């Protein structure tokens, strides 16, 4: 099973240092180069360089020759990206990606990619989200279906994880990208189920904010007045 | 590990020649093969190389486009073909294997073939005349006697000369051939304990493959 599993999201202050790991499995770590790729929010892919996993020699792309350090712990089949003297422009998602090989030679492509690590560079404190249920007034029905929602308001940094009934409700969901409201993030999610599902069965949105170590359950209840 | 090349060639201008380089003692397809030219009495010139795994040749810019590197990998052999031969192609050609470190290529060449001599010439092949050199009347020179073999009037190079099938090898000087009026002349001297000659026979063996000549001259003392 070939996996590149990267470390979780990081929030760091300008001038600080961040170190991201990429834990490889399912193949001989030392036989494939490990590449690093930066993707700034809403922008394209940018190759940062690679590290030779047999020799440990790092090669940096011309825009990453300053404050960037690739390293290994080969006993752990792990590759590391360290960024020193963090700047706001270092706010991005970083991917590690393995060399693609033919039977013998490199293709100079990247076949397996990690899930990525989001780095946020900011002097702001962490704010846990407020979590609000969204239900039609008095549980007023809307034909054969009902749409419920979850309002996740005022958090920093990204990300949050939102699920419905712990992920057992996955179809008919729309989770909206976060926007900046009062300098913090707000997002919402909708879920649509059949009228005969709710309120007869339990619907709960689950919101996890790893930066603040919070996990909130909000049961959606019909409410009048 | 060894690289063994094919024998000397004589060709007319405009002909082609194909030189082999057979590798032994390693996995042929793991190491690049280089070709290096050495004109007579000159230095070394890299012609380019061939990737033994892919077959892809790389030619130095002075060696495009009469030159062709190929492989027979099932025979662990690399070949160099020179087409439309010119007088300037007269040289010794070496194959030489890539040298790699445990981790990266060094862009050196560690094992070399013995070289293949190519002569390009319109001159016609001429067999040598082989003459014995003995002191007048077998007149002695103290404890040692020097004998010789004169190999006169041949083209092209090379000849092979040995003494007693090559079993006599100590105290031999085989002299570099010299070109005169389209023809080479070579000599060799052998020096032996005086008591051993003419009691123990001394014979020079001369082969000139280009002319299909193979002669042997026993050295005997002669009078006046």
């Amino acid at each position: 099973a070939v996996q590149l599993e990267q470390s979780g999201p990081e929030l760091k202050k300008p001038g600080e240092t961040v170190k991201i790991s990429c834990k490889a499995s399912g193949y001989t770590f030392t036989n494939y180069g490990m590449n690093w790729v930066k993707q700034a929010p809403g922008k394209g892919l940018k190759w940062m360089g690679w590290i030779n996993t047999y020799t440990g020699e790092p090669t940096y792309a011309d825009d990453f020759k300053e404050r960037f350090a690739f390293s290994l712990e080969t006993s752990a089949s792990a590759a590391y990206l360290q960024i020193n003297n963090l700047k706001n422009e270092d706010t991005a998602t970083y991917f590690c990606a393995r060399d693609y090989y033919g039977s013998t030679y490199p293709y100079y492509a990247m076949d397996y990619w990690g899930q990525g690590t989001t780095v946020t560079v900011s002097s702001a404190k962490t704010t846990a989200p407020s979590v609000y249920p969204l239900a039609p007034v008095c549980g007023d029905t809307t034909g054969s279906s009902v749409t419920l929602g979850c309002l996740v308001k005022g958090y920093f940094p990204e990300p949050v994880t939102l699920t419905w009934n712990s992920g057992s409700l996955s179809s008919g969901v729309h989770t909206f990208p976060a926007v900046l409201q009062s300098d913090l993030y707000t997002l919402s999610s909708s879920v649509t189920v059949t009228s005969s599902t709710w309120p007869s069965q339990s619907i709960t949105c689950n919101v996890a904010h790893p930066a603040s170590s919070t996990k909130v359950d909000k049961k959606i209840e019909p409410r009048g007045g | 590990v060894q690289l063994e090349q094919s024998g000397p060639e004589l060709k007319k201008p405009g002909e082609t020649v194909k030189i082999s380089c057979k590798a032994s003692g390693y996995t042929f397809t793991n190491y690049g093969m280089n070709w290096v030219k050495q004109a007579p009495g000159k230095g070394l010139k890299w012609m380019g190389w061939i990737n033994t795994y892919t077959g892809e040749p790389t030619y130095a810019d002075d060696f495009k486009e009469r030159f062709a590197f190929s492989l027979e990998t099932s025979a662990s052999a690399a070949y160099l073909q020179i087409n439309n031969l010119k007088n300037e192609d007269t040289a010794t050609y070496f194959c030489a294997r890539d040298y790699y470190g445990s981790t990266y290529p060094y862009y050196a060449m560690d094992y070399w073939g013995q070289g293949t001599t190519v002569t390009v010439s319109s001159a016609k092949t001429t067999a040598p005349s082989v003459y014995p050199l003995a002191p007048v009347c077998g007149d002695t020179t103290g404890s040692s006697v020097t004998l010789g073999c004169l190999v006169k009037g041949y083209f092209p190079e090379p000849v092979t000369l040995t003494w007693n099938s090559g079993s006599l090898s100590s105290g031999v000087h085989t002299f570099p051939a010299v070109l005169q009026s389209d023809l080479y002349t070579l000599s060799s001297s052998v020096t032996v304990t005086s008591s051993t000659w003419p009691s123990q026979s001394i014979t020079c063996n001369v082969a000139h493959p280009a002319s299909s000549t193979k002669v042997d001259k026993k050295i005997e003392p002669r009078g006046g």
Partner: peptide
């Protein structure tokens, strides 16, 4: 770990 000058990554 070198084949025709291509070294391991």
């Amino acid at each position: 770990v070198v084949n025709n000058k291509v070294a391991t990554h």
